[PDB]
Amino acid sequence: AAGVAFQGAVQVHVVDHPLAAARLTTLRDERTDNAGFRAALRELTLLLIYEATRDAPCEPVPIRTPLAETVGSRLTKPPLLVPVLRAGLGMVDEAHAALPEAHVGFVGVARDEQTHQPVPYLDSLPDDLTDVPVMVLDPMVATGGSMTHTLGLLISRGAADITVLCVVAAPEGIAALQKAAPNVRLFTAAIDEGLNEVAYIVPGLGDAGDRQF
Amino acid sequence: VHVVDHPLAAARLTTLRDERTDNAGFRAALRELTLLLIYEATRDAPCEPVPIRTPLAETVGSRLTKPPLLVPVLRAGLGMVDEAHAALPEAHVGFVMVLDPMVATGGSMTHTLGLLISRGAADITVLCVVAAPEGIAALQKAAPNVRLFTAAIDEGLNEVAYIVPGLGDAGDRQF
Amino acid sequence: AVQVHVVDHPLAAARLTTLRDERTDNAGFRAALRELTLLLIYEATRDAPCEPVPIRTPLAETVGSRLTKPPLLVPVLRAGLGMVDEAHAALPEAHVGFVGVARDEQTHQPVPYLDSLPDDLTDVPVMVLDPMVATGGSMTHTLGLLISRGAADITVLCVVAAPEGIAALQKAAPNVRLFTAAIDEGLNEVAYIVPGLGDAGDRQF
Amino acid sequence: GVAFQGQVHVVDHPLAAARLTTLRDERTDNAGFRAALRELTLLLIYEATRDAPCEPVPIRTPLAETVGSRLTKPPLLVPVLRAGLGMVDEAHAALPEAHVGFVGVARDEQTHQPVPYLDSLPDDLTDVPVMVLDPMVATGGSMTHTLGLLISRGAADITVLCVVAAPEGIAALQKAAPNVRLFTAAIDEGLNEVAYIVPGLGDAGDRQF
């Protein structure tokens, strides 16, 4: 937990938190059913959301309360959340709960049976100009192709500071992160060994989408 | 006394305070705030390894060895627990992490902590959203090893012994 | 006795089957409980009232309905708080009151403890929530203090019922209505419902 | 409380009507809008799944052996993106065993026709029930697009869940598919200049995201 620097000075932060570890140990077990995999994934997403939303600026708000008037606080950056589909959709339906005020955009990638190159059909996103913080929500950061391709259109609209949330990433994937966007930050629950013949992360979680749907 | 100044916390606390907010949003911004308290207060927690196998290959995870006995204090700290079970699924529950939105005077809490360590309760953690100096004063008066996690420290209580500014009556704003 | 309503719905039966299996982890036990509750709520809230109310859409003026008299929820603890935090969702407008009870491992009696409510007056519908209505002592104790304040119509939502428990119900109150997922065989040596689910409390806490 | 037309079933339930009223209100926060949506989704599921738990289950309780039931043939859920995803993380709650498929389309500004795109779909042949989830069945284009590719893969009986439908959308349904079943909480008068349903709720997506 620091986490590491890597090649393009890609900054990674490893959520080593105990309840993080426990949810993670639930997510990888092959004994666990898709329900418990969805629920484990969800509660694990707020952990990442919390570790990433630390240095998020704020803003005072004039407020009442019961028994007289007082002043509170309210975050000031409106985080665009971006689920990478298919897999990053369990993560979003209560990042909302963590971040109610935050808006959602849709871009993603899907992999070929053999070549493994990302397929790109979709474009339903905001007017994502400059000063807009963007968290990308993808569980398995594997080769990077899927990740690299979303950020490819993020930065095309001039996406500012980028954070990426993921349960597990691989040294291949983070490397293709540095090559793509040197000033994006990455939050994982674990770094792994690497990929395999089928570019699945190992040990990892299996196919993250399949065991939610 | 550990004050969770995290922005999501300060936000959620801002919402609990507000008079405009419905009990439901009150109940929603409380449960969600209780998670942050859990996350800060469990960050030095002892663990334990677990041999498991993934669908692909075999490895070793971490249990957390000694999960806590939650204790919610009635009537107020039960809108906390039905989401604290989400954070800690293996936590057992009693009626130690003590769960109570307003530590005001401290009697309700210390009366609980008196029967906690009666039986032999080691390290205790307390979780509230708001505390009064009076209540914290009562605390170490009773157990001076306990730790306390709160979203803010307020001025103190008033004539009726409510925390000011505070949120009102935390029980009344959920039930 | 009477009046029982068995929720024999497809999803309801699957959730009960999960709740009964001993193989199921208590996280899955609370989740299947949680889910199985709304089904009971949905059935018990079919002959509820409505207003209608004037509201405005982003596009036109219209009228909807709400509930005129949303019920006072009364979870029976220790067991019945896995039930209530999702009933909340189904009925946002419902208020909550609390009492708890504890049946012994010898005397067979519940040591009731709780008196945390909204004082009585109406003409207030009440939905008492507790998963196992076995002996009836826990239930009957609660209903005594509900109708002590003058409780009108009482609904009881539970997971499983025993004939002995239902027998005590119309011993205490013959006008309450009961919604169960199943009526079982009865109790045992230890005043547990057989086949049942075991202890409903222990399997969430 | 259900109801019928003449395929269409209007869920006139007290909680459904209470939850519906909340979805239209403009005063409600989008969080409460999605919270109100979440509950009203299950109500529709419960009314629409009055059927099929035709498997008994041998199980054993902590106090002796007994037999229960589960559901045979659990439906493939198909939320229409981006709107009907506030619905599906809790349909999951209703139907734990249900697998999920994705197939979204938006509506264009002017023009009219939905620019379609989306093929994240399981291995579907014949005897597989489908419950499509989308809050607003307006023009019918978004829906029929989905159903066009569902029944390309030989989809059997199809159910559609929505919060409100317009007469124009249901018109579009039975010309695309005359055997599909529809479940809404209310039937409104219709669409407007820009093809929003009036009274409706405004835009169901924007009111969650």
Curated annotation (Swiss-Prot), chain B:
Listed transmembrane segments: none
Positions annotated to bind uracil: I163, G168, D169, A170
Co-factor remark: Binds 1 Mg(2+) ion per subunit. The magnesium is bound as Mg-PRPP.
EC number(s) stated in the UniProt entry for this protein: 2.4.2.9
Signal peptide stretch: none
Disulfide bonds: none
InterPro entries linked: PRibTrfase_dom (IPR000836), PRTase-like (IPR029057), Upp_B (IPR034332), UPRTase/APRTase (IPR050054), Ura_phspho_trans (IPR005765)
Name of the protein this chain belongs to: Uracil phosphoribosyltransferase
Record's catalysed reaction(s): UMP + diphosphate = 5-phospho-alpha-D-ribose 1-diphosphate + uracil
Record: residues binding 5-phospho-alpha-D-ribose 1-diphosphate: R75, D100, P101, M102, V103, A104, T105, G106, G107, S108, D169
Keyword Endoplasmic reticulum: no
GO MF annotation, one: magnesium ion binding
Cofactors demanded by this protein: Mg(2+)
Pfam families: UPRTase
Family affiliation: Belongs to the UPRTase family.
